[PDB]
Amino acid sequence: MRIDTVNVLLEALPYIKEFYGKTFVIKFGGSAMKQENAKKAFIQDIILLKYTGIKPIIVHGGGPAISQMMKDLGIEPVFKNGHRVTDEKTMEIVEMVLVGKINKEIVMNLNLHGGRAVGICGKDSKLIVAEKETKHGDIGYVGKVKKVNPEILHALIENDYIPVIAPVGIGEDGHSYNINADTAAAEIAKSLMAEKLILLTDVDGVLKDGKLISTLTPDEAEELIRDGTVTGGMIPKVECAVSAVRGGVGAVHIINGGLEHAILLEIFSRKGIGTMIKELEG
Amino acid sequence: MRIDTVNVLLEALPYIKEFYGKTFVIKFGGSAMKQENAKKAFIQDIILLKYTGIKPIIVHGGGPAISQMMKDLGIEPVFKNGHRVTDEKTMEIVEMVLVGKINKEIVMNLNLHGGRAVGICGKDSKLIVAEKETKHGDIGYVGKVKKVNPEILHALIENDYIPVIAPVGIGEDGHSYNINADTAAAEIAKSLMAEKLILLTDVDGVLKDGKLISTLTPDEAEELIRDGTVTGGMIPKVECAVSAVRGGVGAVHIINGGLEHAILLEIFSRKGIGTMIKELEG
Amino acid sequence: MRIDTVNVLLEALPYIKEFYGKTFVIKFGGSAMKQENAKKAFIQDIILLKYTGIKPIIVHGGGPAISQMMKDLGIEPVFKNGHRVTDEKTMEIVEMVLVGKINKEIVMNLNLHGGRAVGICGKDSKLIVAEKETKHGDIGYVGKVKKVNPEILHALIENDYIPVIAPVGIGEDGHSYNINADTAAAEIAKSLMAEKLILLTDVDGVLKDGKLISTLTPDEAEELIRDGTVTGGMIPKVECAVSAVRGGVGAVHIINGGLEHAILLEIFSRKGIGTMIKELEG
Amino acid sequence: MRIDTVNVLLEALPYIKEFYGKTFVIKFGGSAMKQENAKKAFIQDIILLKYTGIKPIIVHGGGPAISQMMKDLGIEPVFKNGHRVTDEKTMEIVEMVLVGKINKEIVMNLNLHGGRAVGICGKDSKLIVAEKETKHGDIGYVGKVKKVNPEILHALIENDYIPVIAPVGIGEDGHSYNINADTAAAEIAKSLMAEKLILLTDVDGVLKDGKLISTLTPDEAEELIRDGTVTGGMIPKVECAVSAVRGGVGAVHIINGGLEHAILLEIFSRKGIGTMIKELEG
Amino acid sequence: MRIDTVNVLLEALPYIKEFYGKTFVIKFGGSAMKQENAKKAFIQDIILLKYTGIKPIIVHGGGPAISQMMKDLGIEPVFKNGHRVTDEKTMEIVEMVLVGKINKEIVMNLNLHGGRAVGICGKDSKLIVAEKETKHGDIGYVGKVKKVNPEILHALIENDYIPVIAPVGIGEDGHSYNINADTAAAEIAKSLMAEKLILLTDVDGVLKDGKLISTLTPDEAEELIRDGTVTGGMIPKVECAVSAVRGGVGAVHIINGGLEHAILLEIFSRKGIGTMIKELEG
Amino acid sequence: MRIDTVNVLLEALPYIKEFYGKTFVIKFGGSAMKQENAKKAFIQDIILLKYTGIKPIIVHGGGPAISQMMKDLGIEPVFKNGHRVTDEKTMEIVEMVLVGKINKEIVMNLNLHGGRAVGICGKDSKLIVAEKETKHGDIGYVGKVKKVNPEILHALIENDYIPVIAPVGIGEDGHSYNINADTAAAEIAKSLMAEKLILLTDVDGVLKDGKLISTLTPDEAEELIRDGTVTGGMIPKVECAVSAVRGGVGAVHIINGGLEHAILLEIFSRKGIGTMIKELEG
Ligand SMILES: CC(=O)N[C@@H](CCC(=O)O)C(=O)O
Ligand SMILES: CC(=O)N[C@@H](CCC(=O)O)C(=O)O
Ligand SMILES: CC(=O)N[C@@H](CCC(=O)O)C(=O)O
Ligand SMILES: CC(=O)N[C@@H](CCC(=O)O)C(=O)O
Ligand SMILES: CC(=O)N[C@@H](CCC(=O)O)C(=O)O
Ligand SMILES: CC(=O)N[C@@H](CCC(=O)O)C(=O)O
Ligand SMILES: NC(=[NH2+])NCCC[C@H](N)C(=O)O
Ligand SMILES: NC(=[NH2+])NCCC[C@H](N)C(=O)O
Ligand SMILES: NC(=[NH2+])NCCC[C@H](N)C(=O)O
Ligand SMILES: NC(=[NH2+])NCCC[C@H](N)C(=O)O
Ligand SMILES: NC(=[NH2+])NCCC[C@H](N)C(=O)O
Ligand SMILES: NC(=[NH2+])NCCC[C@H](N)C(=O)O
Ligand SMILES: [K+]
Ligand SMILES: [K+]
């Protein structure tokens, strides 16, 4: 009863003072979109951050929808190898599913509870200018971010709108490219000198094995990739968080999307429920 | 030859003065979107409107792109008789082709010439609130406009952005509805009391016994649907035109979208090249 | 653990949205200044309301300090009866203790935790214009509020300062008058169309005997004074709350000052911990 | 023809974009001030410049009206030698025709076609601070420019007014000095860092053996005054042009004041109708 | 003496408070324009009015300089009858002395003592729109005032400039009309709803049999023109005074242009040195 | 007599111009607060400064009022030798007489004449942060200024309020300290880099062999404390004056507070009536 209330609020409220007016870039990866209750709490968390004066910016990935469409549209995966190739027709379907399907569902859910969210993509006012990714050879319209023009995002958050961004970039050649969501969300936070970058994943956070490491610095994060503690798909995430932070972002939080109110618990408590990467005061 | 340059300018410059800062809602139909040459001159015209200080707003349709998706997807039409029926799955493909492909091609083009266009749709910040169009029975997720919330538009145009709108509204329930681009375009123009509403068709304008009618008062226009001179799809148009004019829109122009620079010739010349409907005045 | 956090925050946060930017007038009566821990929590509550965007305004009464000074200064209570008389020399000592002693201690405590509080009184920019109270005959410089000039309060809260007001008013004759704190705090909230008026007392709130009545309307409050449920010193308080509310104040909360974080618990929970008086929506 | 309208506009509209808000200083010479149809066109071009968002500033000359005023006043054009002379009696008359007669003739016309013109001279607010001319002994009160105070001009054009300026300078001793309009116009231009200075002469411009010279640069222009292409009174002008260009002015234009609508053709077409002097930088 | 300073200031400083930011229109008549020491004082008072925060506007007359210009130009003051006449030739000369000579003499002086003066006439921005005078047959181009457009004046005084206005009116036909300075000054006053109109005459003001009249009201003043106290040319002036007062002007002042520092003494002392006409309202 | 009125105004008006919008920190001592007649003329002067557009700030002392409270309270002095000692209880009575009585009498007076005064003290929003003055040993809660936080002052004067400051600062610990009004007044003036710092004393100014010294540069002033010409309490003053001037204060004036209208005579006359210390200049 009562005391739980006092202590939660005394722990929380301060954070309302510090984050009021700041920008949080939140990456909707896989997980937090699977189980229904986790999906509901998430939508709710965003609305709360908005009630407290925070400017949330959402970034989402692809998923089931894309593989399905490709099949239902009788199209097979093409490879050069380092991976799958993305030919014109495939890019058109990806952009169609991401923008016309996933992006707008999130916008509907949010606008169903007061979020005033408007969906857009890298093409809009050239938010994300991209270029051909060539490390594995010409494998299609796979891109790397060349520049971020955040004016549109400032115009939106400045008028109380929550951007919902689909990872599709525009190249000078006018063509469109697919972009890794984590990277796009990180590049978008760097260009805004955003307070936080929140990456939702399928785990509690970085585990120094059997245990969750609550805090880390960019240097301590890399060291764990070098000494082999960090492996799998978790490597590219942490590597993304390290870059974001060294690029001007206040802090990056890696947390479990399958955890109900993971976002609410990570931001309004002092201990959190995931891993936070950040430079020391110094 | 000098003589020409002088005459065209003495006649255009005055319009640049009176239209500065004004808003023009333009409905982009099928013809001007079909021939690369009318389409190239169209983008060119929006850009010139922007350079003269006019605030354009674009609302586009769909057509071929949608049907093709239907066929490539094995989705079979359904009747609940009165006509076609936008069902659950049909809507999703419509929303996906309008938002994810058509909308973004227009945004790309404009942004390839300094238009600073951002493409949204009826769902974003609930710009277009719709409810199931019940007159022709239960034909599915076909809707009529309950209300237009123009805030996002104002935010975008005041910040020098060109909104490219997809005709898909949202219902209080939360389901997306397909709306007639002409009505949509006419409704938002009313909501903003725009200076002009421009409808690009495939015909020169409103014809009577093979003769283009230059001018029309709303009344004269009702007596042409009444008189039987206006028929077929042109009825819904003239209908929107009259509604728009009485609702506060300065004037609506029904011109031939297949005519190169139709917009330029209609706006910056005294006689015009199509039909303009407006009240009497001094 | 956890869930307590989620439910407290989900119950609280909404209120941050509604009260942000609003003004709360808080009356520091007797009680909440007695036991030390209650005094500490109170100071803390004010700072929190400030962290959340609320504009608190404090009003305090007299107490032990005044009786003491009168004795230490060898002065005896004079009566005409309806009460104690307030002769020039007595008024001078009251104003000295209230302004020079009580008022500034509160300011120090607050400014010890970030409150940016500045103490002032009814004399300042003629905040409280008063006049001779004559219902019991000329008994000295006892006053009734004749007018409130809240400009000074707007200048302060508008610049992030928390006013701490001592109940001393100025009369046109230039002389100063003592004013009942509850009345002054109520008159000050009315003149500001303040969202809330919070009266701290020595009880849980209005008790329909053995039980605490959580909510009431101005009419239901008076009825309880007529039917004799409300008696004692609690009559003038409720009567004060009724007036304030009928004068334009969002709502008045009567709560226990001896209760730790009474303010925090009353404003960030839906049930509260005292009595709230307010007109119905209608 | 519809192709003339398209072409003329596709050329002009872009200049409209880049000249919007800029300032043009224009020297109203003797030529265009003569033939009723050359004069009509000029007053019109000035207005159209205003309609497109440009801020025009006009500097006029004298000559005829003055000479006739000397002689009518029983005074014969006095000399001493180096040219004429402007003794105290001759000056006062000069200032009377330039400011009292001519300057008002120009304002009276513009203001019959919505010009919002207000005439002033170098004395008003000490716009043009001049010093007794020395390079030619003591030729009366003829003077040179020592300082320009555009404050008044700025104030005027920011309020949608068109400054019609008379070449009379004011000296530190309150005294008046006659000044060369072209050089006054060129000095005020530099003083504003205007976008353009237009000098209207009695001939197409700089003729390279009959053949007219379209564009040049400061360094080139001086070379034609050296080899002897620029002869006669076309030398004085070409220099101001240079002076101003190096003084910060965007570009200078020497056109046929006689050529009806010379201004219009020179500014909104890419080839102009006269000689343009400017620096190199695409 | 120290008591003189105290008294003079305790009187003046209050007027400084209430005249701060207000507008005063002042008619520079023939009197104060004559004796080098009367003239010196005037230019000084105007500056001091500016130093205290008042916005002065000056309207000058002509007379002498003109008459000498008629005759020097071989033209004798023509008549027909009802008084003089101002045929086309006579007007142009008039406009030349009022605007070209006189108006600049006043600006040249103020601007030697930090006045920031800029001279203009009724033509500039169509300040004074006049109609051919009719009450006296056809006496040339003498005219009456039909409309004032203070826009220019406002623009000027808001930028810390002092308008020096010449009485020449501009008619709907672009033509020029001579106008009575006093009435021009009174019309512009009403047009601005100025705080004061100062008419400088050739005598202390309105003399009630030698004895000077301090204050009056509109209704009273007219009565002295009826019984015959106000005789001679002191009738025309007194009327403008009335006209303006009823026209909205705060008050009017008729003082001795001859009296050195008349303005200063009349405005900062409670008794004034001349006759003041105004409405009743403490 | 006219002759006087003119001379006083030609000499005062110029000062009204240069002091408009400037800030004057005035230290109100014992003399001007002792005689009802100097005190009446003092309030009158602050009001006139306000009416001329100057932003006065008042810092007052104490003296008699405090001692009397001491005696009427049976509080006995204490020495920790070097001099008197402000102990726990002594401070509380000092704070109570300065804040609760003296401060409020000045606020009342001013507000009785339109001064819109609000009285604060060093504690309010930590305007004056002090630490125990350790030079003369441990004499109690006597303090020296560690820092001045002028925000509240800026808020008050920008909103047309006259701050009446009590010389009681606050220490980081939280204990209140007694500070020298002269230093306090000199410190805040430095913090605001006020135009003037005015010290009202009981002597005409800085004297040398019975002669008042009109002007002084900081250097000339140090050589008078050094030379032995300045003695006693005047040392701390001249000391503050020099410090203030070098710290950014435009000039400090040391005048006789017992002289009626000392402030008026010093500010609005060229010669002044006391001593003005300022750097050399042009
Ligand atoms: C991997 C990454 O950057 N993004 C995810 C987002 C979708 C998800 O988590 O399922 C992706 O697959 O592209
Ligand atoms: C029908 C109508 O109102 N609009 C068209 C626009 C598409 C086009 O021109 O191809 C539509 O299909 O919705
Ligand atoms: C009664 C009331 O209005 N105020 C209280 C405030 C002090 C307190 O509660 O002790 C008072 O005694 O004047
Ligand atoms: C002052 C001056 O040089 N004036 C020139 C203006 C006309 C011109 O150059 O064509 C003049 O004829 O008197
Ligand atoms: C135009 C006009 O009436 N002028 C007057 C101005 C001087 C005056 O009235 O003293 C004139 O003498 O010509
Ligand atoms: C001493 C000094 O600096 N100030 C005086 C001011 C009081 C007065 O003039 O009576 C003081 O006692 O603190
Ligand atoms: N995993 C962690 N270390 N979490 C700490 C979170 C701290 C705080 N709520 C923030 O948002 O910064
Ligand atoms: N169809 C017409 N008759 N059009 C007339 C066009 C008038 C003007 N150019 C305009 O855009 O308003
Ligand atoms: N006693 C009560 N009824 N309390 C309800 C409080 C509700 C809410 N927290 C408010 O501040 O309005
Ligand atoms: N003579 C010329 N070079 N004319 C070209 C001028 C082109 C265009 N009017 C401009 O101001 O830039
Ligand atoms: N003749 C007079 N009545 N003069 C009184 C003028 C007083 C003061 N100068 C004012 O403008 O109000
Ligand atoms: N003591 C002096 N000599 N004072 C000169 C005063 C100068 C001017 N009046 C001022 O206030 O700055
Ligand atoms: K633009
Ligand atoms: K004021």
Q: Is the CB of B34 under 6 A from ligand 2?
A: no
Q: Is the CB of B143 under 6 A from ligand 2?
A: no
Which pair of tokens denotes residue D105? 């003739």
The DSSP output letter for D212 is B
Residue E58 φ then ψ, to 5°: -115, 135
Domain hosting residue F276, numbered range? 1-282
| Strands of the E143-148 sheet, one edge to the other | E143-148, E128-132, E169-170, E176-177
Do B51 and D265 lie within an 8 Å CB cutoff? no
Which ligand is located closest to the Cα atom of residue D97?
Answer: 4
* Cβ-Cβ contacts under 8 Å for B64 (sequence gap 6 or more): B30
Cα–ligand 13 centroid distance for B15 (angstroms): 18
Q: Following CA atoms F246, F247, F248, F251 in sequence, which dihedral angle do they give, to the nearest 10 degrees?
A: -60
Q: How many CB atoms lie within 10 A of CB C282?
A: 4
CA distance F202 to F254: 10
Q: Are B and E close enough to touch, i.e. 3+ CB pairs under 8 angstroms?
A: no
Q: Which atom of ligand 7 is nearest to the CA of A251?
A: 12
Name the one residue in this structure whose structure tokens are 């300018």.
B9
CA distance A171 to B112: 10
Do C124 and F107 lie within an 8 Å CB cutoff? yes
Q: Which of C5, F181, E180 is nearest to A264 (CA)?
A: C5
Q: Is the CB of A247 under 6 A from ligand 1?
A: no
Q: Which stretches of chain F are assigned E, i.e. beta strand? A: 23-28, 55-60, 117-121, 128-132, 143-148, 162-166, 168-170, 176-178, 196-201, 207-208, 211-212, 215-216, 252-256, 275-277
Q: Is the CB of B30 under 6 A from ligand 2?
A: yes
Q: Is the CB of C65 under 6 A from ligand 3?
A: no
Interface test with F, best of E1, E3, E7, E8 (most F CBs within 10 A): E8
Q: What is the DSSP string of D64-79?
A: HHHHHHHHHTT----B
Return the half-sphere exposure (C-beta side, CA atoms, 13 A cut-off) of residue E55: 18
Which pair of tokens denotes residue B42? 């169209």
What's the structural domain count of chain A? Answer: 1
Resolution in A: 2.8
**Which residue in the set B100, B125, B156 is minimally distant from A100, CB to CB?**
B100
CA distance A251 to B272: 59
Known binding residue D84? Answer is yes
SS (H, E, C) F134-161: CCCCCCECEEEEEEECCHHHHHHHHCCC
Under DSSP, is residue A122 helix (H, G, I), strand (E, B) or coil?
Answer: coil
- Using only C-alpha atoms, chain F has a radius of gyration, in whole angstroms, of 19
Residues of D with CB under 8 A from a CB of E: 72-74, 92, 95-101, 103-104, 107-109, 111-112, 116-121, 123-126, 151-152, 155-156, 159, 161, 168, 170, 174, 176
Do E152 and D118 lie within an 8 Å CB cutoff? yes
> Is D216 in contact with D169 (CB distance < 8 Å)?
no
Dihedral (CA of C14, C16, C22, C28) sign? positive
Q: How far is E164 from chain F (nearest CA, A)?
A: 22
Residue D82 φ/ψ region, left for φ over 0, alpha for ψ in the -120 to 50 degree band, beta for the rest:
left
Q: Which amino acid belongs to residue F122?
A: G
Q: Which of A60, A142, A180, A235 to mutate to test the pocket of ligand 1 (most atoms within 8 A of CB)?
A: A180
Exposed/middle/buried for residue C112 (C-beta within 10 Å: 0-12, 13-18, 19+)? middle
CA distance F282 to F270: 16
Exposed/middle/buried for residue D209 (C-beta within 10 Å: 0-12, 13-18, 19+)? exposed
Q: How far is A265 from chain C (nearest CA, A)?
A: 7
CA distance E51 to E114: 10
CA distance E129 to B122: 54
The DSSP output letter for A280 is P
Which pair of tokens denotes residue F199? 């010290």
Cα–ligand 8 centroid distance for B215 (angstroms): 9
- What CATH number should be reported for the domain holding residue A62? 3.40.1160.10
Q: What is the DSSP string of A11-77?
A: HHHHHHHHHTT-EEEEEE-SGGGSSHHHHHHHHHHHHHHHHTT-EEEEEE---HHHHHHHHHTT-PP
Cα–ligand 1 centroid distance for A61 (angstroms): 5
Q: How far is F219 from chain C (nearest CA, A)?
A: 39
Cα–ligand 14 centroid distance for F47 (angstroms): 9
Name the one residue in this structure whose structure tokens are 């190169």.
B260
Which ligand is located closest to the Cα atom of residue B51?
Answer: 13
Query: What number of residues does chain B have?
Result: 282
Q: For chain E, give the longest Cα–Cα distance.
A: 63
Which pair of tokens denotes residue A91? 């890019």
Q: Are B and A close enough to touch, i.e. 3+ CB pairs under 8 angstroms?
A: yes
Do E96 and D92 lie within an 8 Å CB cutoff? no
Known binding residue B140? Answer is no
Which pair of tokens denotes residue B137? 């029975």
* Cβ-Cβ contacts under 8 Å for D198 (sequence gap 6 or more): D24, D25, D26, D27, D252, D253, D255, D263, D266
* Cβ-Cβ contacts under 8 Å for F95 (sequence gap 6 or more): C100, C101, C104, F121, F168, F176, F178
Q: Which of D267, D238, D251 is nearest to D193 (CA)?
A: D251
Q: Which of E135, E257, E228, E128 is nearest to E187 (CA)?
A: E128
> Is B17 in contact with D51 (CB distance < 8 Å)?
yes
Cα–ligand 6 centroid distance for F63 (angstroms): 6
The DSSP output letter for C204 is S
Which pair of tokens denotes residue A102? 């996933």
Do F8 and E4 lie within an 8 Å CB cutoff? yes
Q: Which residues line ligand 10 (CB under 6 A)?
A: D 15, 214-215, 266-267, 270-272, 274-276
Cα–ligand 6 centroid distance for F68 (angstroms): 15
Do F53 and E53 lie within an 8 Å CB cutoff? yes
Q: How was this structure determined?
A: X-ray
Which chain D residue has the Cα nearest residue B18? D51
CA distance D259 to B280: 40
Which ligand is located closest to the Cα atom of residue A180?
Answer: 1
Do D8 and B9 lie within an 8 Å CB cutoff? yes
* Cβ-Cβ contacts under 8 Å for B73 (sequence gap 6 or more): A72, A73, B93
Exposed/middle/buried for residue C128 (C-beta within 10 Å: 0-12, 13-18, 19+)? buried
Q: Is the CB of B37 under 6 A from ligand 8?
A: no
Do D268 and B48 lie within an 8 Å CB cutoff? no
Which pair of tokens denotes residue E87? 């045929």
**Which residue in the set D92, D121, D161 is minimally distant from E125, CB to CB?**
D161
Which chain D residue has the Cα nearest residue B44? D10
Q: Which residues line ligand 4 (CB under 6 A)?
A: D 29-30, 61-63, 167, 180-181
Q: Which of B233, B124, B106 is nearest to B168 (CA)?
A: B124
Which pair of tokens denotes residue D117? 């013109």
> Is F82 in contact with F137 (CB distance < 8 Å)?
yes
Q: How far is A200 from chain C (nearest CA, A)?
A: 19
Residue B199 to residues B107, B254, E269, Cα–Cα distance (Å): 19, 5, 71
CA distance E99 to C220: 80
The DSSP output letter for D81 is S
Q: How many CB atoms lie within 10 A of CB E279?
A: 12
Which pair of tokens denotes residue E264? 């200063």
Name the one residue in this structure whose structure tokens are 């349709």.
B61
Known binding residue E24? Answer is no
Do E155 and D155 lie within an 8 Å CB cutoff? yes
> Is F275 in contact with F215 (CB distance < 8 Å)?
yes
CA distance F177 to F95: 9
CA distance D191 to D188: 5
Under DSSP, is residue E18 helix (H, G, I), strand (E, B) or coil?
Answer: helix
- Find chains touching chain D: ≥3 CB pairs under 8 Å: B, E
Q: Which of E67, E160, E143, E168 is nearest to D99 (CA)?
A: E168
CA distance B166 to B120: 6
Do B123 and A111 lie within an 8 Å CB cutoff? yes
Interface test with D, best of E159, E162, E165 (most D CBs within 10 A): E159
Which chain B residue has the Cα nearest residue A125? B116
Do A8 and C10 lie within an 8 Å CB cutoff? no
Residue A50 to residues A39, A188, C13, C14, Cα–Cα distance (Å): 17, 19, 10, 10
Which pair of tokens denotes residue E24? 């005063």
Known binding residue D152? Answer is no
Do B155 and A155 lie within an 8 Å CB cutoff? yes
* Cβ-Cβ contacts under 8 Å for B139 (sequence gap 6 or more): B80, B82, B83, B84, B85, B86, B133
Name the one residue in this structure whose structure tokens are 């035109």.
B241
Q: Is the CB of C143 under 6 A from ligand 3?
A: no
